[PDB]
């Protein structure tokens, strides 16, 4: 029994869309400056639910009107997915972000919406409230960016104690902070935002060394790639972005080893076959 | 009984391709700087017709030769689509533009061509014959651009009485005029070219308050979007771009209201099912 929930946040409260409705969530996350994406197709919407959701999802009231000073400008939605058997649940969180696009793919008799959300779509933030540092180290610029965005940070890199003259006073909005942190020092150390945690680290290092995930069962075959090993798996609520993996394959014996994660492709369908996560991984140092 | 005509303009004259031949025209117009495009798949061409059409359509005689001072450099083609029953016709005009690309999609025993027409592909113009105004207001710069392009203009906006210094002295060609008029003042007021009429108006205003189109019959469902209402319809020869719509839905009761049009998705197939136009619309003010 797969259990998949799409939990919105609206003034009335959270309206959890369960797995009984036909839901299909394609989440694509990566260790880049780019906002991770979630495309979710939900069918079986009643008229009342459609009016309660789609009317709130809009790109107005911030362009031709004002109605904006803080959150509630756009609806923030999380995704909680997992398995459930014998009464125990495994519902972890796989996405948190704000909607950007609304459409319908399937016309009647199955009026099914398709909505597009990106993580940290509050880029129309308070146009940088606190000024960036004049002269500071990389770690302290990262701390300033995390404080401005409101997210807790994990800074683990060897470039922290490098002074920068003038780190990013051309930044216009809060989102461009991540692009700037990505722009400086970009052979390896790429910063990203996973859910509500801003991670700045080298690309060959793991966020949590004690949290390696031993993988033994795959879907298909764990194959080589340009950088490391690429493989698909059934949904395990313990695999994050940039986490450590301990691939132990059978079909391919040469791909065994420890890998860090760079890209993640969730494809979760409660009422359809695809319920897999695809992992891109590179050698871990 | 669908009636679709593709009318070219060549030295011999207009050679109308009727709906008896397998024709398929996919047009996509929008309120932007980009030229609205039409892909045309035409089957059943005879050898003589192919010789008459494809040999005329070319990208030469202006790069490795001269043969150019005015039109006739490339063939201009219009599209007249509609319905016909009881003897009365409904053939409107849905596209006017010049070809740029020609290829073959279907090999024998059905030699089917596929041409690609773009509106205002005569950018091979007299490299701006008349100099732009040195200092001038927005409306007068728009009038100069319309005169240079040879098209009549509809300038209806609240930014007309705003002066500019050097309004487009880097412009190289006639096409870049529209890009410039779009470039300045791009929160709302986006100028475009619909057929042979250059429209410069605010995005939340109707070019024509008296030409609202009451819509009650839809194919599928009139849905919400991140901007406005999106809906498909059977071909009505009274829906233009930037026009006003008066959506009155049944499935979705709260999408009713008055909307302006931003995009248009014509898909007309005489010998196939798709004969629909898709309308993107935003709330009108």
């Amino acid at each position: 029994k797969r259990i998949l929930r799409v939990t919105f946040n609206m003034p009335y409260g959270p309206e959890v869309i369960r797995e009984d409705l036909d839901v299909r969530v394609r989440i694509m996350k990566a260790a880049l400056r780019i906002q991770n994406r979630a495309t979710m197709e939900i069918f079986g919407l009643t008229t009342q639910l459609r009016e309660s959701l789609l009317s709130q999802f809009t790109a107005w009231k911030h362009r031709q009107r004002q109605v904006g000073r803080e959150d509630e400008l756009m609806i923030k939605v999380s995704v909680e997915a997992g398995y459930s058997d014998q009464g125990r649940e495994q519902v972890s969180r796989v996405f948190v972000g704000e909607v950007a696009i609304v459409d319908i793919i399937s016309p009647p008799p199955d009026i099914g919406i398709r909505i597009q959300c990106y993580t940290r779509q509050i880029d129309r933030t308070k146009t940088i409230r606190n000024m960036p540092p004049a002269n500071t180290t990389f770690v302290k610029f990262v701390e300033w960016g995390a404080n401005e965005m409101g997210l807790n940070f994990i800074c683990d890199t060897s470039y922290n104690d490098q002074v920068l003259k003038n780190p990013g006073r051309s930044i216009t909005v809060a989102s461009a902070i991540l692009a700037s942190i990505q722009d400086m020092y970009m052979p390896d150390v790429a910063a990203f935002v996973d859910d509500d945690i801003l991670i700045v680290k080298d690309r060959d290092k793991v966020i949590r060394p004690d949290e390696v995930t031993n993988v033994n069962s795959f879907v298909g075959i764990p194959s080589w790639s340009e950088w490391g090993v690429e493989f698909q798996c059934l949904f395990e609520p313990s695999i994050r972005v940039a986490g450590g993996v301990a691939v132990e394959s059978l079909m391919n014996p040469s791909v065994n080893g420890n890998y860090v994660i760079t890209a993640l492709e969730y494809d979760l369908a409660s009422r359809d076959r695809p319920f897999y996560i695809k992992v891109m991984g590179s050698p871990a140092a | 009984k669908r009636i679709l005509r593709v009318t070219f303009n060549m030295p011999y004259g207009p050679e109308v391709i009727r709906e008896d031949l397998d024709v398929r025209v996919r047009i996509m117009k929008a309120a932007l700087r980009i030229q609205n495009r039409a892909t045309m798949e035409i089957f059943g061409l005879t050898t003589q017709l192919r010789e008459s059409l494809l040999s005329q359509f070319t990208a030469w005689k202006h790069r490795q030769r001269q043969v150019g001072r005015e039109d006739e450099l490339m063939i201009k083609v219009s599209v007249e689509a509609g319905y016909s029953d009881q003897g009365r016709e409904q053939v409107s005009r849905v596209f006017v533009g010049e070809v740029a690309i020609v290829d073959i999609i279907s090999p024998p025993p059905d030699i089917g061509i596929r041409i690609q027409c773009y509106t205002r592909q005569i950018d091979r113009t007299k490299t701006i014959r008349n100099m732009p105004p040195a200092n001038t207001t927005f409306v007068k710069f728009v009038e100069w651009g319309a005169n240079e392009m040879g098209l009549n203009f509809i300038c209806d906006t609240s930014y007309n009485d705003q002066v500019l210094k050097n309004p487009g002295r880097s412009i190289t060609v006639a096409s870049a005029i529209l890009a410039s008029i779009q470039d300045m003042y791009m929160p709302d007021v986006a100028a475009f070219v619909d057929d042979d009429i250059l429209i410069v108006k605010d995005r939340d205003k109707v070019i024509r308050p008296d030409e609202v189109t009451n819509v009650n019959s839809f194919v599928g469902i009139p849905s919400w979007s991140e901007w406005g209402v999106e809906f498909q319809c059977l071909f009505e020869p009274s829906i233009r771009v930037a026009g006003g719509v008066a959506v009155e839905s049944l499935m979705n009761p709260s999408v009713n209201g008055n909307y302006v049009i931003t995009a248009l998705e014509y898909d007309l197939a005489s010998r196939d099912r798709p004969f629909y136009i898709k309308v993107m619309g935003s709330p009108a003010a």
């Binding site: 994406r37 990106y118 216009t172 | 929160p187």
Partner: peptide, 19 residues
């Protein structure tokens, strides 16, 4: 689906129009 990638190559537009 190239449509989702098209919809993704539009997110680069902040409140700054700068203009």
């Amino acid at each position: 689906q190239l449509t989702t990638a098209i919809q993704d190559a539009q997110n680069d537009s902040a409140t700054k129009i700068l203009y």
